[PDB]
Amino acid sequence: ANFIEKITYLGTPAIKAGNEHLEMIVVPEWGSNVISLVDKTTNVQLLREPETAESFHDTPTLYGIPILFPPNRISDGTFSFRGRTYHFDINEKDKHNHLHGFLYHEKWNVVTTKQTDEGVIVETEIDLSELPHVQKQFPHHAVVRMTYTIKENTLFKHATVMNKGKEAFPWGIGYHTTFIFPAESSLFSLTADQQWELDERLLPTGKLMDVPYKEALHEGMDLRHKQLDDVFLSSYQKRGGENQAVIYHQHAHISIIYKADEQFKHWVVYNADGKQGYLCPEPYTWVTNAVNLDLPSSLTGLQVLEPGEETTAKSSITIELN
Ligand SMILES: OC[C@H]1O[C@H](O[C@H]2O[C@H](CO)[C@@H](O)[C@H](O)[C@H]2O)[C@H](O)[C@@H](O)[C@@H]1O
Ligand SMILES: OC[C@H]1O[C@H](O[C@H]2[C@H](O)[C@@H](O)[C@@H](O)O[C@@H]2CO)[C@H](O)[C@@H](O)[C@@H]1O
């Protein structure tokens, strides 16, 4: 049994959808942000929700599931692709970067909803050629379609990126997924062995380094007194196995299994100062500043769509009760 219901989320239109296990709320106007994810059996919210519409706008990448296209930093907002140079708004002024892409602060359209025994689908979409200011920065006919499916106890979360233009473009995608993370009763684990070393501007130098506490990181570890803003290299590339973040709420015995396919080669993990009760295990298909690295694509995970092509990048959130 499953349902869709149109609602108002803090004065914005929104869509609630779900089954007997999980409910989502997606707000198309807020960059198609999946702002709420609720476990119906235990009745607990899993995502960091905003108090007021205003405080959501203050920081639109620190609530629910913000879409980062492309993710994280480009230095000086400048890169070159196939001879051609680009200039993106430098919205991060101290570090002199462009930060977090085009689509998190924009109006997305609902393409369609669909319901079968296979669970409930909501689809959203944005055509970048319909946003004049983005075209100044990035004159390409990129179209992004999100497909959200709740089925059994899982939210499947698929990004289809399409080139409907006449020139090839590099692209990567990331999510700023913000989970409620209580430092004293929450354990965290990630399939990662190495991380990207960063300069003062949170930009990759090019070098990789062993994660000292990698064992603990594999098994599940508390984050008490540990400030993270780290760009990890998914272990799957070298070792196979899983590609996932896991969060474990000790009180209610809830496991949140955040899976992602082979295209997601990096996870940025962010908890601000560690005293804010949240955590952002952010899977990216490409490393920070990927566009500006003279490094193999199988490492940076940089991708290219030629005219007429499309790719789908798959991730899921699984709630397990144990
Ligand atoms: O912004 C275009 C520049 O990209 C490279 O340099 C930046 O990115 C590096 C990788 O993160 C940083 O280490 C470096 O400090 C940044 O300036 C490229 O090396 C430059 O030639 C480009 O101008
Ligand atoms: O202007 C800098 C901005 O970012 C810092 O934290 C970032 C983090 O570095 C990124 O990797 C990103 O994914 O998460 C945060 C922004 O969403 C600072 O901690 C933050 O206060 C500041 O606004």
Side-chain angles (χ1 to χ4, degrees), residues 73-80 86 96-97 197-206 288-294:
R73 297 161 173 96
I74 292 170
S75 42
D76 311 329
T78 306
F79 70 86
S80 76
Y86 290 88
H96 213 261
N97 299 305
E197 189 195 47
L198 303 169
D199 66 16
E200 66 295 334
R201 301 165 59 194
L202 303 165
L203 297 166
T205 56
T288 303
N289 214 26
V291 272
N292 283 310
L293 285 167
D294 291 298

Side-chain angles (χ1 to χ4, degrees), residues 54-208:
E54 292 71 35
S55 88
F56 166 89
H57 298 322
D58 289 336
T59 62
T61 67
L62 293 179
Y63 296 108
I65 310 168
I67 300 163
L68 314 159
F69 183 90
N72 215 283
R73 297 161 173 96
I74 292 170
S75 42
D76 311 329
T78 306
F79 70 86
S80 76
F81 177 71
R82 290 181 187 181
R84 177 162 201 194
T85 295
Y86 290 88
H87 289 279
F88 287 15
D89 300 359
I90 297 155
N91 58 340
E92 177 191 58
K93 305 257 216 315
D94 45 18
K95 290 180 177 57
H96 213 261
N97 299 305
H98 170 90
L99 188 56
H100 281 328
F102 302 120
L103 316 182
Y104 68 93
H105 141 79
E106 296 290 347
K107 182 206 215 268
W108 295 57
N109 321 295
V110 203
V111 194
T112 181
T113 75
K114 167 167 180 176
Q115 290 147 284
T116 61
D117 302 77
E118 304 293 311
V120 51
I121 299 152
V122 177
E123 262 174 37
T124 74
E125 189 164 290
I126 196 148
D127 189 321
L128 282 73
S129 73
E130 296 181 12
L131 315 151
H133 183 73
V134 180
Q135 288 298 301
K136 248 166 266 151
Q137 294 163 98
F138 183 80
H140 294 297
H141 194 164
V143 185
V144 182
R145 188 224 291 151
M146 289 294 306
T147 303
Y148 306 99
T149 310
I150 292 164
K151 164 180 170 190
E152 308 245 300
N153 62 338
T154 290
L155 163 58
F156 299 97
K157 174 159 81 58
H158 293 191
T160 303
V161 184
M162 335 169 172
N163 191 343
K164 282 178 155 179
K166 284 159 183 187
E167 307 177 59
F169 57 82
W171 74 273
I173 204 166
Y175 296 91
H176 210 301
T177 320
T178 310
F179 293 101
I180 289 159
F181 193 82
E184 299 292 336
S185 62
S186 283
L187 298 166
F188 172 73
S189 82
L190 180 53
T191 48
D193 296 350
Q194 297 182 282
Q195 56 181 132
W196 294 86
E197 189 195 47
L198 303 169
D199 66 16
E200 66 295 334
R201 301 165 59 194
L202 303 165
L203 297 166
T205 56
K207 289 162 155 159
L208 295 159

Side-chain angles (χ1 to χ4, degrees), residues 157 242-245 256-261 264 267 283 314-318 320:
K157 174 159 81 58
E242 313 308 335
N243 178 35
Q244 65 193 28
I256 302 159
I257 291 100
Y258 196 3
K259 291 178 194 290
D261 67 22
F264 292 95
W267 290 78
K314 298 164 312 287
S315 46
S316 51
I317 298 170
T318 304
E320 279 174 353

